[PDB]
From a paper:
Sso7c4 appears to be the first repressor-like protein described in crenarchaea and may play a regulatory role in gene transcription. The Sso7c4 protein possesses a homodimeric DNA-binding fold that forms a swapped β-loop-β ‘Yin-Yang’ topology, and it belongs to the SpoVT-AbrB superfamily. The dimeric Sso7c4 protein, which consists of eight intertwined β sheets and two flanking α helices, forms a dimer via intermolecular associations between β1 and β3′ (the primes indicate the second monomer in the dimer) and β1′ and β3 in the flank, β2 and β2′ at the top, and β4 and β4′ at the bottom. In our study, Sso7c4 exhibits DNA-binding activity and alters the trajectory of the DNA through bending and bridging.
We also determined the crystal structure of C-terminally truncated Sso7c4 at a resolution of 1.4 Å to address the potential effect of the flexible C-terminus on DNA binding. In contrast to the wild-type structure, there are three homodimers in one asymmetric unit of the C-terminally truncated Sso7c4 crystal, which is in the P31 space group. The crystal structures of the wild-type and C-terminally truncated proteins are similar, as indicated by the good superposition of their α carbons (the r.m.s.d. value is 0.35 Å for 85 atoms). In the crystal structure of the C-terminal truncation mutant, the R11 side chains of the three molecules in one asymmetric unit are all exposed to solvent and flexible, consistent with the results of previous NMR dynamics studies. The FP results showed that all the C-terminally truncated proteins exhibited lower binding affinity to 8-bp, 10-bp, and 20-bp DNAs than the wild-type protein. In contrast, the C-terminally truncated protein bound to the 10-bp and 20-bp DNAs with similar affinities (~11 μM) but bound to the 8-bp DNA with slightly weaker affinity. At higher protein:DNA ratios (1:0.5 dimer:bp), a considerable number of C-terminally truncated Sso7c4-DNA complexes were observed to form a more open circular shape (67%, n = 109), suggesting that the C-terminally truncated proteins induced DNA stiffening. However, the DNA contour length was not reduced upon C-terminally truncated Sso7c4 binding (1834.97 nm for 5 bp/dimer and 1830.06 nm for 0.5 bp/dimer), implying that both C-termini of Sso7c4 are also involved in bending DNA. The FRET data confirm the EM observation showing that the C-terminally truncated protein forms a rigid filament along DNA. In conclusion, wild-type Sso7c4 induces the formation of a more compact DNA structure primarily through both bridging and bending interactions, whereas C-terminally truncated proteins rigidify and open the DNA molecules at high protein concentrations.
Numbering used by the authors:
A (entry chain F): 3 to 48
B (entry chain E): 2 to 47
C (entry chain B), D (entry chain A), E (entry chain C), F (entry chain D): 2 to 48
Write the structure that this text describes.
Amino acid sequence: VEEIVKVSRNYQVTIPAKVRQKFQIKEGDLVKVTFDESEGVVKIQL
Amino acid sequence: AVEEIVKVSRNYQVTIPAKVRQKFQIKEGDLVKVTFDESEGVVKIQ
Amino acid sequence: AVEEIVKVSRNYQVTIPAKVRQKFQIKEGDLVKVTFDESEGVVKIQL
Amino acid sequence: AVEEIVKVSRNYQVTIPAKVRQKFQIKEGDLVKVTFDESEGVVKIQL
Amino acid sequence: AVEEIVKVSRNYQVTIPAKVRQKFQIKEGDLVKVTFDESEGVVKIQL
Amino acid sequence: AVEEIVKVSRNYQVTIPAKVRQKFQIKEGDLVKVTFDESEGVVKIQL
């Protein structure tokens, strides 16, 4: 479950609908955004 | 860790905050890949 | 040394950590030679 | 030698092939150490 | 600047790191010109 | 000039050739700074 997205103004990233089936975020929700040094990726967690 | 709390915007977007972008150097308009990692139960942005 | 403990993934796949890849620069589709070194008891990965 | 050619997988993973695994017995979930060997300029995987 | 520290490898080789290659796109097998700039006292690599 | 054409090696390595090394006296294990110089469009390698 992988999709390419374009980063929006003010560095916003859509979480695509196919990803959200597994990660069900809603307007208003708090998420933790982390840089993972081990893999060199950003992680988003609920 | 380099972590921040972000509130999910309208239309299911997540801002990548400045502190995170110091290590993950995306620019407005960039393409990125958004994946659900099942093992860890997080979204990865790569 | 630049190294990390990693958990093996499905289908016997091993993630090469980002700090290791700074020195050993691989991308999907690259050919590598994977060898078992008996003397050292390790697997070696070469480009 | 026990060697095989492997194509790097998505997300910077390398498959450990069956011929290599006859000598280096790993599977999904196992812990391994992945290192960059500076002297040889290769990646090594150790149990 | 786009700069990185590299340790000279065996046989007098220098890795061109990924951040530098975003600007200087070289591939294995490519011809490049290595020059000593006598006045600045540095090496320069050109395509 | 002291210049020579070389072929890029695996893992994006460049050999610093012998005629260059007579002037830029590097050795396995030395640290060097590798920079992309935009003005000149070259990679610089400095001790």
